[PDB]
Design a protein around this ligand. Structure first.
Ligand SMILES: O=C(c1ccc(Cl)cc1)c1c(-c2ccccc2)sc2cc(O)ccc12
Ligand SMILES: O=C(c1ccc(Cl)cc1)c1c(-c2ccccc2)sc2cc(O)ccc12
Lengths: 154, 154
């Protein structure tokens, strides 16, 4: 059993590395790292609900939009964490690039990210990314509310 | 080496569990789980800069404010992740409780959290928590900006 778990973790780690280093036109094929029913998306948004992309085919379609809205995106400072589950990895990283959202001025977006990767039969079953949406608001020129801190320790 | 690493990870996991289960008046002693120079705090805020508490003594002072502003806070749905580093753990969880911030109406705050725990010689050297500040804005009655999605795929 341990030999099967070690083998799974070593293989899955390679897929995480491949995912995090996928850049440029290769992003059009990143959905091939998922199971057919795999899910990916952004779990931290202004609405409080994830923006989840369901299915390898929808993931491929999203990559088209991704390359338009984030045309030179790179992940940096990548740290991959294996876990006691050979099929579950976490990644801490930063990400940066131009942001070209419909109806907003072109901007530069930089943020800190956590990624969750869960695997099934050698491919990604669920990818989730977590960030602070306030930094994306800033990149789009959107005003960020400020919690008043006068009454708080400083 | 393996034995020293396994020993570290088993002990450190117990500290993570104790931290995540600490509620009520026990929060006044949670800083004893840190090194003398340990750091804890919130890495995801409206400013984009962490609110970091530096030093075991300042962590204990912050616990006083924590119990005023988050008087009944509970961490729920706790999933602890060991990593390949016996001194580095991640936690996925939820948190809930009343939020009583100076100069805001009393609210009910619920959010999803990720915690990072790094250890040194049996105690926490660095704790960081990551969430989506938009849900804390909502609990405080603060208006959350909306990214316009008309131009985006749906
Ligand atoms: O960047 C994103 C985003 C980034 C990656 C993924 Cl997988 C999903 C959404 C994003 C939106 C989006 C929706 C559909 C297509 C493209 C972007 S809508 C929105 C709203 C937010 O408050 C924060 C982020 C986003
Ligand atoms: O909840 C927090 C918070 C919670 C935990 C920690 Cl360790 C730090 C800040 C918090 C603030 C705070 C600062 C000092 C004392 C108490 C609250 S100020 C602020 C501002 C934000 O945009 C989001 C959260 C917070």
């Amino acid at each position: 059993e341990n030999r099967a778990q070690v083998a799974a973790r070593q293989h899955n780690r390679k897929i995480v590395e491949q995912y995090m280093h996928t850049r440029g036109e290769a992003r059009l094929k990143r959905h091939l790292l998922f199971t057919e029913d795999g899910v990916g998306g952004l779990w931290t948004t202004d609405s409080g609900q994830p923006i989840a992309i369901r299915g390898r085919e929808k993931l491929g379609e999203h990559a088209v939009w991704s390359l338009q809205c984030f045309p030179d995106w790179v992940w940096t400072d990548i740290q991959i964490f294996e876990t006691q589950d050979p099929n579950w990895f976490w990644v801490e990283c930063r990400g940066e690039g131009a942001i070209v959202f419909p109806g907003y001025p072109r901007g530069q977006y930089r943020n800190h990210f956590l990624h969750s990767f869960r695997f099934e039969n050698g491919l990604i079953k669920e990818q989730r990314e977590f960030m602070n949406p306030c930094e994306q608001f800033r990149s789009l020129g959107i005003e960020v509310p400020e919690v008043r801190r006068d009454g708080l320790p400083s």
